[model samples]
Target: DHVKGDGKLTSKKISVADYNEIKVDGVIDFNYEQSDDPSTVEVTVDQNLHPYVNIEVKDRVLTIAFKGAKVDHFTKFIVKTNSKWLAAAKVSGNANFMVNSPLTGDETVIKANANSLVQLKETVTVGKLDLNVSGSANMVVNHLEADKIECDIDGSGSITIKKGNAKEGDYSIVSSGDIHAFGLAVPQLSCKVTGNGLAEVHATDNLKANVVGKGNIRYKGPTAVQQRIIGKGTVEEVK
Candidate 1:
């Protein structure tokens, strides 16, 4: 319900190394607490609320811990940084957490449950993109109609890819869960993947892909893919 602040409110700029060392507690749901009017941005959360409350971030990390909660009953720690959220996220659970922002040159690490939503700019080069999910997650890099693009994904949960603007570059996903990418069509895209998870990409261009897992592989682009099935997974072609 509430949280404690760790003097991080004083420091202006920090590094990932110093960010992760701080301890924290509580959950942060921006969609609920933060109003649409950008004028009411509360930098701190109540430190005593349980099962529901926003967590305070000091040195880039949520300064508490979630060592005794389950997936559905777990609280979330969301990071919305524009310039410096470069800390490494090392928390775990089976619920949901999100890292979303219109970054120009920012980075984040998440340990989430149901989903993790990411929105990037069209020309900024992100430092690193990694997702250690135990449930389901949806990651998207929007308005990325740039000349250069690069990303990687690791998931034990389901994934969904929507419309975007990545002209050409590299993409990959490894999941023990299902992967679904069928939204507004995109073109000139190339991708690859590996693991005991399912892989699927549906776009407008020839979606170059690769899959290795125990699930299935399904892709519909405007072209080529390589998949290795081990268990009861399958590769299908659709319309």
Candidate 2:
């Protein structure tokens, strides 16, 4: 509830020379005091550069992967000039990524915030993605690989995955709820929708999906996909 530490209340000016640079080859951790407003955690990679950061929020614990000697979560998010990108980005509460507009990178964001239960299977090639989700029980992303690229995604409430991204480039994405974006190619991908509820995606490789429960699937442009769709749903193809 109370964010403590050096300049916790007073934003300190960390100099470029004092850029507290950290190199991560393994797992790093952070301990933070969550806010009471369903907590909207402010997350970024760096003060000047986007450092590869990993975040995982499971139940009441919010764990972050970074380099430092700090164990307190509130003290981990220090203002530096080299932090960039959210790695192992995961959330368990109702969360949202504030975007200036629709993301145009190979980024991934995932969130699961449903009251009931849901499931998802995603295979991606590239792009920025956002997922807003809430469910009781779920499975999403079966396989994912960015080869140390920039990937943004979250899982909460309930959801599952079948696959992830590529192996030789930068990618930005986000996931929440129960949904999938199979075989999409973009420098970054941003997705924010409830899963087992509704889903949409675009790609040139392969888009394969199968949904259960009150699920709906839609695509808004010339997209390619194969659906093992079963539900009170409608599937239309546009080229």
Candidate 3:
């Protein structure tokens, strides 16, 4: 309650923090927009919440976290950078990420956890993309064009690719987590499932699946199925 009561925000004064990776956590409204300035994050922080809040970029990593009992919802903040070095983002605990860029790097990693989300407003064209989602978190990579993808999910979290094409992907679903890429067309996909999780993808080349516990790997494509099962799980083509 003290944290919430003492919270404040202004149209703001900021500092230059250089970073290649950005990490943020806990309830807040956050953004990442491109600009020519050396990465600046606006601010107006209260003393009561100051110790529990920090924003810094060290070793090319920007860490912004609001930790305590809780951070009130709708705390708006923005990280504006034009550096192509920005390659990864880790978001957690109800904090969502908004980005406006094509995500041009040859590599990009997105980690979303605990009800958090990252929904890209632009198409991403990367050589390699790694996505990690957990605890009901979700990521909507609208139109991703990647050469390779690694999608890992846990605890009911999900990753969705509205439409796109990839050359290859290695995906795993754990504890009811899902990979909702039914609309994504990929050449080759290797998926593993643990527990009741599901991996739904459209693979055109090969669908190599391993099911450890009563889970399912549903695929739609005229692809060859390579499966290994230890329980009452299934790896089937879904028309």
Candidate 4:
């Protein structure tokens, strides 16, 4: 859909055909909502930055583009879908995002960069969840249930998983950042930290922690575990 109007912060809602997957790019805020009808995709944008919406379809994937907006123009998009779609979201350049949709798919990914924020409003279930954060950004997920999970943090960004249940996963951190995971039930776990970064996890069964270059892992696990520490970092087990 194309939009042209006076350069003021205005809101518009557009209705279009349905899609099975959604992708977004650039400096825009985004969220997902439940749709009463399963054959259409709903979009709403409010901005003063001359924003426009571009929708495309390829292989059942619906790509929603919000472009031609200033960085500080307060552009946001609310996409309403049937909740069976695979959600893939990537944002950069001071953009932010909030996800309230109950994602139901085999695999899903959420990525951010350049001082952005990625947040989840509710618990979600997926086959596998992949999260990446960099360039001083942050990511927060309330709860997750997945077969496997992978997370990475770079630059000075942070990632917090408030609660989760998984069979196994891997976590890594670089630069001066931290990854805090709480209320987790995982059987096998692997973690690495470097350059003053820290990986802190609570509630786990088995852990394999590796620290290098002044990094640390604050974790507690069963009495049987293996750890290797190098440089000035330590793997501490707290009661």
Candidate 5:
């Protein structure tokens, strides 16, 4: 177990030697790693916060719910789990989920809400990646190659896809912020932006955008565009 933090909160690292599926929710910091032992997770946190690691299994789904844990700016809750057993993660509040592992799962949904951040540092190869951001929260996908990728954003949060490709990509944004992608070649790309949201895409094969209410669309690659702009928005080809 590795640890790093400087705060008045008491720190401890607890290890779980068995689990199949893991779900985390609350104001905590999360990290994932490949486990040497099968279905194990090493959790590092501040305080003897036993409620932060409420692990239960039923119907073959292992759930880890951390609720009502007192968290501050200096609170640190780090969880390193077996990459194979991480099925889905739902994050809310001011929590942050950062993982540096190749994600391989049947279906995965990563949701960020209320100023949280979900950062994936490594390549992701999931069957379906459903990502959502709301209320000023952001999601950063460093290298993502998936069969199907769906992203929805509301309120002033952004989702950035840095590199890689997807077979099918769909995005919807409302209120504000943008979906910025580079070096991400999607065979079929669909984007809908309303209420001042921007869609910045690059290297896409095809694009379909519907912009309304001061929203904008910027495309850099050769995409056969089918666009509809209403109420003071622009859909432009860029370099």
Candidate 6:
């Protein structure tokens, strides 16, 4: 299924400029769309939230905040930007962010927490990318290309990169947080896991890991592996 915008909601368009970072909080659905013009933020929020919702941009950061009223459903922010890329994005509190355009930048970061979700419909290319997920949140990317990539997962959150290319990568997980990276070709990747969780990597060169408890490291490619495991930890190569 795809993210569809509703025209039946209360729509409001705000003016914005020089913003590259987006921070969304509370229960809502946020959508990022690129337009040929700059300085526009449109909202198609639920009628109940239309009176209390607010959107603001300052110091190159756009923030979306609203009262979690007892509406039928959450609000939706349909934003349009011409900046071509974002430096960072933060989502929290049972929210979701969807983008129809490619999320590209240099040394960018994306975060999701507290059952939040983020989906980039297009590829994400950056010099360095950091993904942080916590509290059962999830992030789905179409494809990723970065020189360096770092991922941190906690609780039961998950991160998925359908495909990627990276020179170096590092991942750390705790609790039941899982990393599902498919066809991410990293030359060297390191994993540190605690408790019951696993990191799946596609390292063509080398794989280094430190696993404790029921943690595991699963990988593809014929990479040389080195690990220090304690308790019921395992490092398995995918056939």
TM-score of each: 0.50, 0.34, 0.84, 0.81, 0.83, 0.88
Residue 135 error, candidate 3, Å: 2.6
How far residue 139's Cα lies from its native spot in candidate 4, in Å, is: 1.0
Better of 2 and 3 by TM-score: 3
**Residues 1-239, candidate 6, lDDT per residue (tens digit)?**
12232335677776777578888877666778644466677777654456666677788888866544433444354444344457888989877888778766687788899889989778777899898998889988778888998989987988888897989999899869888874788989998999688788898899897898988888897788888989888888887
Off by over 4 Å in 1: 1-27, 30-91, 94-101, 106-132, 135-155, 167-175, 184-196, 203-208, 224-232
RMSD of 2: 13.1
Off by over 4 Å in 3: 1-9, 13-15, 34-37, 43-53, 66-82
- Error (Å) of candidate 2 at residue 158 is 12
lDDT over C-alpha atoms for residue 103 of model 5: 71
Best by TM-score: 6
- lDDT: the better of candidates 3 and 6: 6
Off by over 4 Å in 5: 1-22, 34-36, 47-53, 57-75
RMSD of 5: 4.5
lDDT of each: 0.42, 0.34, 0.77, 0.71, 0.73, 0.78
**What's the TM for model 3?**
0.84
In angstroms, the error of model 5 at 157 is 0.6
Q: Tell me the tens digit of each residue's lDDT in model 5 across 26-116.
A: 6667676544455555566555454445755565454565545443334566665564555666677676788777776677787778888
Lowest lDDT block of 10, candidate 6: 1-10
What is candidate 1's lDDT per residue for 46-149, written digit by digit as tens?
Answer: 23223333334554444433333342332234333222333444433222223343333334444444444332323323443343444454444333333434
lDDT of 3 by residue, 1-239 (tens): 43463445444445655677878776666777644566677544453455555667788887776556565643445434344455898998787787776667678888888899888778788898899888889888888888998998876877888888889989988778778899888888898998698888899988888999899889999788889999899988897
The candidate, 4 or 5, that scores higher on lDDT is 5
Better of 1 and 6 by TM-score: 6
Q: Which runs of model 2 end up more than 4 angstroms from their true locations?
A: 1-9, 13-81, 84-86, 90-195, 220-224
